[PDB]
Design a protein around this ligand. Structure first.
Ligand code: ZN
Ligand code: ZN
Ligand code: ZN
Lengths: 82, 244, 716, 114, 305, 245, 209, 66
DNA sequence: TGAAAGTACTTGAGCTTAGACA
RNA sequence: AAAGACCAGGC
DNA sequence: CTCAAGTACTTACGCCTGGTCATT
């Protein structure tokens, strides 16, 4: 669907957060560039967690509606519950 | 074991003294695998030839000679399930049968005699597989175990006097489950035989010791009557797993 | 000596056992209380019990005072032998020692008979434990296999794999079951006077305002009529909410489950901001009203500006909005909570944040969660539940509900009474007799077939006094009548227990058999109740018999067949399929009548209700003086055939709640609702078995994974 | 109430109506035997089944050592102090916990209910 | 008709039907084309008493028994209009006659209800009973036919089951008796009971003869039929009993006189008749009131209304 | 190994079964041969089929081994040589002064009205066997052999034991009627007096009986194979110890 | 007795008027709440051989939206309805131009009667109601929630809102007692309003098929 | 359910009748009433019967021809 | 030695009825 | 050393 | 052309440890 008329909770679900963090950490562990500045951090999990806290993860979530349509939500657009 | 029927698995009243109440496996085999009590003995089997000959020699009536009008008052006689005839004086017949079993003249102690008074049937079983345990015989309110028997049993070494001679003296008696039906037992003589506020006076047998109801594994439990029955069962199961 | 009068609905043995068990239970309870009252504060059993770490009060009772009565299959120890428990006891000994009551405690040690009875009780417990196995595992597997694909989609609608709508919102409110807690409405079940005293915000006093509200705000509240009008509008809206609650919650149950604890959060706001209740507050009540109105808009379960969306949102948040307006009332804020402006703003922000956190996350697999949350208590439910009016409970009842059993083991039906029948016991007995199926054999002392060639001969001597008068009026005396007589004796106790009279019996006989039967009976003055029945033949020729022996069915054996039909199929009173009806005054609030008095309070009325063994709902509801609204039955299929499918949804919900909450355990309403909906949503009653899970139009791979495998794939 | 057997082939008799004399007859169906009926009743069915258990109680029951016995209730015939008592000892006995007493001592065999 | 036609066609025998809510147009064919061998076999109930009695009628079978000997012979006469030996067969069963009679009864009933008692009322019954006996009797079929017509009894040979085997047909008749002696059960019991008691009713049910009250009936609503089989004689006898009870109470209570007792008894009898529905219940209530009056007299107080 | 005691009469009642009360007796002959042949004697619930039981306790029905379906008890009694009803009743009812027992036996006597000869009763039983005999005498012989040998073998097997068989069958019916009247409680299946234990002795005996029978069968097979030549025979090569061992 | 039959007739008539009112047909208030005494006085007490012969108990009502369609209720006097009764009833329907009618059957119907009922779908629709089924108003039961029949416009709005196809909705069988109460045919949608202990009010839509 | 009650085949030609098919273990018996009876319905005969079913008829039968 | 509950198949009953008005 | 059967046992 | 009255037919059961055994 378009950027307007999006119907979905703006809060990011726990499942979306979990999969986004896992995928990002896998990417960072594959030497993907890191958006946020790290300070002596070698474990991709916590680096991805701090990216998520910094709204810098370069992933948009493809939310499939039951009718077959979909909505695109950037990670920064979604507000983290935690 | 997969069957969800719970009735066969339950502990029946008939298991007293013959099968251990506590010792049983836990799982799909609960209540279906039973361990034997300390005093329980399985009937080995015997030919009912002498019993039939004695009964014929003891009057009674063979089935071909009954008048069907005279069978209602008489009491039917069963030997190993076979209907061999009727008898008109159950008292003396049962008394003589018990006396013979006590003296082991014609009927071995393994054979059992049952008198169903209300239904007028007398059943004698000599077949194998019957479960039975020894019990002391009580005449009036006194045991037949006297001081001389115990004195001789203390002397059991180099006396050639053993349990078999005690059985042959008519003091102890082997009673199966369906003969236990017609018997009246007491816990201990020094408690239930002496006169008190009248509860019963027709005690015909007395238990050797009530702790004989337990099996092998359950007999190792110290103070098992102070325990919850599930804990006694758990210990009876775990005792087989104890190392030594 | 037969002085024991049997209680109604119970036999002599049943009431004797009930009285003995009552005495033994009273003794055990008294001994346990006596033992516990003697425990010193240093006693470690008492320490464990009061701490709740392990053990119970009955554990201490069995340790010290009395082990208690031992039961097998819910009854005292049975007579395994010929009317005796053990060979050591006399026959027909029903005393506490013979039937299993254990006088000794574990510390004292059990007697050998008591030891064996305790062994039997422990064997029963062990059998139950080893059975708490395959069948409850089967319940778990069947439930989830029915629910494994049910999911909350991204529009928050709960749908299965086919995208069919199971629930529009999860749990009917769209909230996750983790963050919700128990709360009290505080607007349900106060008196009208107390409701106004607590929620009106009376500004006329002008002195209490100066004490609760700041001096500056008092003049603003008093002077401005807009403030007063808006506050009165708020109170009117709260009264409407109170009426809505009283419609929603009969029985006056104020304990409700809601996302955020408003009272605890108000208290947190008090502590955080150092709120002093002794001082007047600076919080303007109109600011409270506006804050509540604005906050209610940001709590969104249904997203949309459509009127349908507006109504769906209002319904989804209705209960929580009512509670929010109740707790955040202006008078409550000014009187109890004393919150300040910053505290109130923080409270609104916290409410919004907590409610937003409580919203169910799309993608949550609520089907499997509900199935596992419903089957988990089944591993704690009594398999062989025993606990008259016997009702199947626990795992067997759960199997009956889940499998949609055509024939329940204990199908019952509760009856409520409208008029004076509810209050007066005589009319209650009248309704009970009109509902309980009574055949002739239930009221006949004995039946005899006599041969009476002449009716005035009267081979029975006692009848000659009264048969002659019926046999003297024109005709009906001799000729064209069967010489074979069917004489029936009626039991007076049964005759008057049902308030039945001979004329109604004769009317039923005439209706069943027509005028071709001659029915003669005594009067109520006679000490013994008799009824004479003959056969009437109109054949006046009676020559050569015309060889009627082809199927003549001679009058003797014909009368025998007629007597059998009378005794088995006369259905004198009540309706068939109703074996017996129990009548009692319920002391439990759920079965009592609750009304709203003139003061608006909830009063629970004590009225007679009827419970039946066997069920026929359509005719029971049609009977007079039977409440057509509140009369329900526990069996589910008949409600489907009678009251529809939504009634089945509600009734199945209630039955599942009863079978789960009977032990005292609690399960969130969302899982019960999800299961009941997934069963009653295709339009018919979908049982949770291979017959109904595979009847859905799902994928063959879905069906093959569950109990059918090869056959489903073969068909596909 | 009871049945009567044939006198010729020793079979079972059945009730038969006499059309001429209007008298109840029992005629065997396997032969031509016929006998007059005295009781004039055919079928008796006691639904309450209140048959006195004293007839079904056997005197030798007093020999039972497992049965309780009391000194309080004497016999009515011989006045013997000793008596053995027991309950209905039967199923389908409606609701009855009453006691049945049998007098001990030989040749008495008396049964009474209180 | 449809069931036998379908079963016979499935069994091979080219069957068909005459009536079935169809129409002359929708059967003219079935019928005509039956003469010209286009349709070999056609079934009907009573719709074949006409329609060109042809020549080559090979057989006439009765799946169910006819309505009478006259009816059976008039069906069977639609055959044998040649030298063709046409063995006409009748299928019989106890269940069938049972049904036929039950409806012949229902017909006779309705007829009498909307008419009076005629010779035909019993004529139909005894004709059907003659048919039953003929299918149940033992002997030559031609002899029974002649006996029913009163003609000379023919000692026929090779013309009926009786003359073929002197013990096989007897064995079949004996086995008929041995075939059956004496929520699904309710209808079975009702049918068995009504069928058995129809045997008790027998022939010529009739017997209504409701005699009107003669001249001076002291009965309110005397000419009433609300209670069946409550002829006026029974009613004024019950009133006689009521007046006797009232006179006994008058003697035992010493009230005014019996002149008002006449109207009092008429009122009591009318009230009892109104409260009652059937003769037996009416008598029960009448003597119940009499017993109540006697009890009141025994106690001593006057029997107030 | 646990098992029901053989040769004992038991009465049980199933809830939903066609039989209201079922009496059975698992009978074995002195342990000598055959495992067990069980005979059932039962009463049929409550209901008829248009010409039968419509009253107090109904017809008693016997279930013989190797008979395809039920057979009425009185017919079985007549097949034992007791044609007159009074003899059958005397074997069944021991005291004629009891009318309740007599009325309970009443419906069963009605069914056996038609059959009044021992030979026709045997034909009735013979026609209900595993395979109906082609001729009447074969059926009669088969039914007589079944009753004599394979029905209640513990009572007797040889010839004139038919009177003892009749007495024991009457006892079974009497126990069934006593249970129906409630004068005796139904036997409980868990009563250990009704249970026998097969120890090493009986178990190995059951094994060895069949194994030695198979050894004899193999000896016979080897003999018949080796005697068709007619030369001679030697046993030592005809016995395989491998089968038993 | 006869008084019991009079009570049955009064209860059945009252339930029929409530049913007609719930279907949108014009029913006067006094017709809804008719006392037993008022009914007995109006229709003449005893039905057995009395004034109310179960004919003249017929109810003629018209819809609130338009009076043309009307609606008409039948009380056959026959214990079972055959072809002739339904045919004469249909003849009356055609003469009176009415299209919708009910049948209140005593015990049951012949299967030719049911075949004739299902014969004419478009011309005249006839719904068979048992005598026992109408002795109570199932909609007044506490278990039965409030059912509302939605028009095609409301169904279209509902489907467009949730982007739902018809087959994706929960279903309710046409043989459901509540569905029969409102005389609903296959394809319609019912709006169910029931209270809840978590939300307070919940609305469910069930497709009729 | 609808097609089981039609014992005759009209529409189209082939006005001959239809036998009942019974299964005894793995054997199918084309039980003719009266037209040879109890002919062993060989799987070859059933294959020949099914091979001539048109695609439209089998699609109507519920099984997609492709 | 007991022992379980729902569902997919077959089969086999079982029913008043004929004329002359559109 | 694969695949079965049986037995015993733990939670 | 039913439908209630029967007969076959099908179900299942949490994980883990080990031992033996006959056949392949
Ligand atoms: Zn005779
Ligand atoms: Zn005495
Ligand atoms: Zn064809």
């Amino acid at each position: 669907q378009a950027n307007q008329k999006r119907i979905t909770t703006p809060y990011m679900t726990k499942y979306e957060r979990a999969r986004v963090l896992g995928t990002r950490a896998l990417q960072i562990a594959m030497c993907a560039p890191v958006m946020v500045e790290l300070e002596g951090e070698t474990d991709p999990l916590l680096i991805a967690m701090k990216e998520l806290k910094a709204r810098k993860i370069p992933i948009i979530i493809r939310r499939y509606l039951p009718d077959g349509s979909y909505e695109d939500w950037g990670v920064d657009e979604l507000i983290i519950t935690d | 074991r997969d069957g969800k029927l719970a009735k066969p698995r339950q502990l029946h009243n008939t298991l007293w003294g013959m099968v251990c109440p506590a010792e049983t496996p836990e799982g799909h085999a609960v209540g279906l695998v039973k361990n034997l009590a300390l005093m329980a003995y399985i009937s080995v089997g015997s030919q009912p030839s002498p019993i039939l000959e004695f009964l014929e020699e003891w009057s009674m009536e063979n089935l071909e000679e009954i008048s069907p009008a005279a069978i209602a008052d008489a009491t039917k006689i069963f030997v190993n399930g076979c209907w061999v005839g009727i008898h008109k004086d159950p008292e003396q017949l049962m008394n003589t049968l018990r006396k013979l079993r006590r003296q082991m003249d014609i009927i071995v102690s393994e054979v059992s005699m049952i008198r169903d008074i209300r239904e007028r049937e007398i059943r004698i079983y000599t077949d194998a597989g019957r479960i039975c345990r020894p019990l002391l015989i009580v005449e009036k309110q006194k045991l037949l175990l006297k001081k001389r028997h115990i004195d001789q049993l203390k002397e059991r070494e180099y006396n050639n006097y053993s349990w078999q001679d005690l059985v042959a003296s008519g003091v102890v008696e082997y009673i199966d489950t369906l003969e236990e039906e017609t018997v009246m037992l007491a816990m201990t003589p020094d408690d239930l035989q002496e006169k008190e506020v009248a509860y019963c006076s027709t005690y015909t047998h007395c238990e050797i010791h009530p702790s004989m109801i337990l099996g092998v594994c359950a007999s190792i439990i110290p103070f098992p009557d102070h325990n919850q029955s599930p804990r006694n069962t758990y210990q009876s199961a775990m005792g087989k797993q104890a190392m030594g | 000596n037969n002085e024991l009068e049997p209680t109604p609905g119970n036999t002599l043995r049943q009431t004797f056992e009930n009285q003995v068990n009552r005495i033994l239970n009273d003794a055990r309870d008294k001994t346990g209380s006596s033992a516990q009252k003697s425990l010193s504060e240093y006693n470690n059993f008492k320490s464990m019990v009061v701490s709740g770490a392990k053990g119970s009060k009955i554990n201490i009772s069995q340790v010290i005072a009395v082990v208690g009565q031992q039961n097998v299959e819910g009854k005292r120890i049975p007579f395994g032998f010929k009317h005796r428990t053990l060979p050591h006891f006399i026959k027909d000994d029903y005393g506490p020692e013979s039937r299993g009551f254990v006088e000794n405690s574990y510390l004292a040690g059990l007697t050998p008979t008591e030891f064996f009875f305790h062994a039997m009780g422990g064997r029963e417990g062990l059998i139950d434990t080893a059975v708490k196995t395959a069948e409850t595992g089967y319940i778990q597997r069947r439930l989830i296999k029915s629910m494994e694909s049910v999911m909350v989609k991204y529009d928050a609608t709960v749908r299965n794999s086919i995208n069919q709508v199971v629930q529009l919102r999860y749990g009917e409110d769209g909230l996750a079951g983790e963050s919700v807690e128990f709360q009290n409405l505080a607007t349900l079940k106060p008196s009208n006077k107390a409701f106004e005293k607590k929620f009106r915000f009376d500004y006329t006093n002008e002195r209490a305002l100066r004490r609760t509200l700041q001096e500056d705000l008092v003049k603003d509240v008093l002077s401005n009529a807009h403030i007063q009008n808006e506050l009165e509008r708020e109170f009117e809206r709260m009264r409407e909410d109170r009426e809505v609650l009283r419609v929603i919650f009969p029985t006056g149950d104020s304990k409700v489950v809601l996302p955020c604890n408003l009272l605890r959060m108000i208290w947190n706001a008090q502590k955080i901001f150092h709120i002093n209740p002794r001082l007047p507050s600076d919080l303007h009540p109109i600011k409270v009203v506006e804050g509540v109105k604005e906050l209610s808009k940001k709590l969104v379960i249904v997203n949309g500006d459509d009127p349908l969306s507006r109504q769906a949102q209002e319904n989804a948040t209705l209960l929580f909005n009512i509670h929010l307006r109740s707790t955040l009332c202006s008078r409550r804020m000014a009187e109890e909570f004393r919150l300040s402006g910053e505290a109130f703003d923080w409270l609104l922000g916290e409410i919004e944040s907590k409610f937003n956190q409580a919203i169910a996350h799309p993608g949550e697999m609520v089907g499997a969660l509900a199935a596992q949350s419903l089957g988990e208590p089944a591993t704690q439910m009594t398999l062989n539940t025993f606990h008259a009016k016997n009702v199947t409970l626990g795992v067997p009842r759960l199997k009956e509900l889940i499998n949609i059993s055509k024939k329940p083991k204990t199908p019952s039906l509760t009856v409520f009474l409208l008029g004076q029948s509810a209050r007066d016991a005589e009319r209650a007995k009248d309704i009970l007799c009109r509902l309980e199926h009574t055949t002739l054999r239930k009221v006949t002392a004995n039946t005899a077939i006599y041969y009476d060639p002449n009716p005035q001969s009267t081979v029975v001597a006692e009848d000659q006094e009264w048969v002659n008068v019926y046999y003297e009026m024109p005709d009906f005396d001799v000729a064209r009548i069967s010489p074979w007589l069917l004489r029936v004796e009626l039991d007076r106790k049964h005759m008057t227990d049902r308030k039945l009279t001979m004329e109604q019996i004769a009317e039923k006989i005439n209706a069943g058999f027509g005028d071709d039967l001659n029915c003669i009976f005594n009067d109520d003055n006679a000490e013994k109740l008799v009824l004479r029945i003959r056969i009437m033949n109109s054949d006046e020729n009676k020559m050569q018999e015309e060889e009627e022996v082809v199927d003549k069915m001679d009058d003797d054996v014909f009368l025998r067949c007629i007597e059998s039909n009378m005794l088995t199929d006369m259905t004198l009173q009540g309706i068939e399929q109703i074996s017996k009806v129990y009548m009692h005054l319920p002391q439990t609030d759920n079965k009592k009548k609750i009304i709203i008095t003139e003061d608006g309070e909830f009063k629970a009325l004590q009225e007679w209700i009827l419970e039946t063994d066997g069920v026929s709902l359509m005719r029971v509801l049609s009977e007079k003086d039977v409440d057509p609204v509140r009369t329900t039955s526990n069996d589910i299929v008949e409600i489907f055939t009678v009251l529809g499918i939504e009634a089945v949804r509600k009734a199945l919900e209630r039955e599942l709640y009863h079978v789960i909450s009977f032990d005292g355990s609690y399960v969130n309403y969302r899982h019960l609702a999800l299961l009941c909906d997934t069963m009653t949503c295709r339009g018919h009653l979908m049982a949770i078995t291979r017959h109904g899970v595979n009847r859905q139009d799902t994928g063959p791979l879905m069906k093959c994974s569950f109990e059918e495998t090869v056959d489903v794939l073969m068909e596909a | 109430v009871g049945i009567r057997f044939c006198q010729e082939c020793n079979n079972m008799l059945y009730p038969k109506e006499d059309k001429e004399n209007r008298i109840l007859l029992y005629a065997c169906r396997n032969c031509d035997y016929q006998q007059e009926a005295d009781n004039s009743c055919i079928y008796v069915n006691k639904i309450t089944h209140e048959v006195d258990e004293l007839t079904q109680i056997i005197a030798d029951v007093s020999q039972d050592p497992t049965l309780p016995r009391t000194e309080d209730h004497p016999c009515q015939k011989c006045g013997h102090k000793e008596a053995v008592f027991f309950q209905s000892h039967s199923a389908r006995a409606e609701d009855a916990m009453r006691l049945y007493y049998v007098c001990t001592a030989p040749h008495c065999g008396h049964r009474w209910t209180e | 008709c449809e069931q036998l036609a379908i079963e016979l066609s499935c069994r091979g025998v080219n069957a068909k039907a005459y009536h079935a809510g169809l129409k002359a147009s929708e059967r003219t064919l079935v019928q005509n084309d039956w003469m010209e061998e286009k349709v070999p076999v056609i079934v009907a109930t009573i719709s074949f008493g006409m329609g060109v009695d042809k020549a080559n009628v090979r057989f006439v079978a009765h799946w169910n028994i006819a309505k009478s000997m006259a009816g059976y012979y008039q069906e069977s006469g639609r055959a044998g209009r040649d030298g063709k030996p046409s063995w006409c067969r009748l299928y019989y069963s106890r269940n069938d006659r049972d049904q036929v009679s039950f409806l012949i009864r229902k017909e006779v009933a309705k007829l009498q209800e909307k008419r009076g008692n005629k010779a035909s009322d019993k004529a139909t019954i005894m004709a059907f009973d003659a048919l039953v006996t003929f299918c149940e009797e033992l002997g030559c079929r031609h002899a029974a036919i002649a006996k029913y017509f009163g003609d000379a009894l023919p000692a026929c040979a090779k013309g009926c089951d009786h003359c073929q085997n002197p013990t096989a047909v007897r064995r079949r008749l004996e086995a008929l008796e041995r075939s059956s002696s004496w929520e699904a059960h309710k209808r079975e019991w009702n049918l068995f009971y009504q069928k058995q008691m129809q045997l008790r009713k027998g022939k010529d049910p009739k017997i209504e003869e409701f005699v009107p009250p003669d001249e001076n009936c002291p009965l309110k609503e005397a000419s009433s039929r609300r209670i069946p089989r409550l002829t006026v004689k029974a009613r004024e006898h019950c009133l006689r009993l009521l007046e006797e009870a009232l006179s006994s109470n008058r003697q035992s209570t010493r009230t005014a006189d019996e002149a008002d007792l006449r109207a009092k008894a008429v009122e009591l009898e009318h009230e009892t008749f109104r409260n009652a529905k059937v003769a037996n219940l009416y008598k029960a209530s009448v003597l119940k009131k009499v017993a109540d009056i006697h009890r009141a007299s025994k106690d001593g107080q006057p029997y107030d209304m | 190994q646990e098992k029901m005691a053989t040769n004992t009469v038991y009465v049980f009642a199933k809830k939903d079964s066609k039989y209201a009360y079922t009496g059975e007796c698992r009978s074995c002959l002195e342990n000598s041969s055959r495992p067990t042949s069980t005979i059932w004697v039962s009463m049929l619930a409550r209901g008829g089929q248009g010409a039968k039981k419509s009253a107090i306790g109904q017809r008693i029905v016997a279930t013989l081994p190797y008979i395809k379906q039920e057979v009425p008890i009185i017919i079985v009694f007549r097949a034992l040589g007791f044609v007159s009803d009074r003899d059958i009743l005397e074997h069944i009812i021991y005291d004629f002064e009891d009318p309740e027992m007599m009325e309970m036996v009443k419906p069963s006597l009605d069914e056996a009205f038609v059959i009044q000869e021992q030979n026709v009763a045997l034909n009735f039983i013979g026609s209900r066997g595993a395979k109906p005999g082609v001729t009447k005498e074969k059926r009669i012989k088969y039914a007589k052999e079944v009753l004599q040998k394979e029905m209640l073998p513990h009572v007797g097997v040889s010839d004139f034991c038919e009177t003892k068989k009749a007495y024991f069958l009457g006892y079974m019916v009497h126990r069934l009627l006593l249970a129906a009247l409630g004068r005796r409680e139904l036997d409980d299946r868990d009563h250990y007096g009704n249970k026998r234990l097969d120890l090493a002795g009986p178990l190995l005996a059951f094994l060895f009986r069949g194994m030695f029978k198979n050894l004899l069968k193999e000896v016979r097979i080897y003999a018949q194979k080796f005697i068709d030549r007619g030369k001679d025979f030697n046993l030592e090569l005809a016995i395989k110890t491998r089968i038993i061992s | 007795d006869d008084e019991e039959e009079t009570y049955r007739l009064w209860k059945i008539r009252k339930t029929i008027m409530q049913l007609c009112h719930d279907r949108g047909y014009l029913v006067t208030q006094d017709e809804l709440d008719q006392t037993l005494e008022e009914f007995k006085a109006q229709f003449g007490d005893k039905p057995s051989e009395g004034r109310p012969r179960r004919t003249d108990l017929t109810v003629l009502v018209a819809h609130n939206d338009d009076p043309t369609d009307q609606m008409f209720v039948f009380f056959p006097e026959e214990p079972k309805v055959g072809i002739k009764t339904i045919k004469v009833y249909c003849q009356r329907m055609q003469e009176e131009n009415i299209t919708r009618a009910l049948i209140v059957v005593q015990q049951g119907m012949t299967p030719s009667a049911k075949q004739s009922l299902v014969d004419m779908a478009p011309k005249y629709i006839l719904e068979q109601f048992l005598q026992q089924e109408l002795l109570i108003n199932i909609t007044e039961h506490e278990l039965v929630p409030e059912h509302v029949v939605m028009t095609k416009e409301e169904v279209t709005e509902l489907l467009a809102r949730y982007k739902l196809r018809e087959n994706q909705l929960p279903r309710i069988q046409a043989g459901d007692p509540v569905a029969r109460y409102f005389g609903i045919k296959r394809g319609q949608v019912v709006k169910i309003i029931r209270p809840s202990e978590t939300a307070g009010r919940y609305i469910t839509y069930r497709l009729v098929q | 359910d609808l097609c089981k009650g039609k014992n005759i085949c009209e529409h189209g030609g082939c006005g001959r009748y239809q036998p009942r098919i019974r299964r005894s273990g793995l054997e199918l018996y084309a039980e003719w009433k009266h037209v040879e009876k109890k002919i062993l319905l060989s799987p070859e005969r059933v294959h020949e019967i099914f091979k001539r079913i048109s695609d439209e008829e089998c699609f109507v039968l519920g099984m997609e021809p492709r």
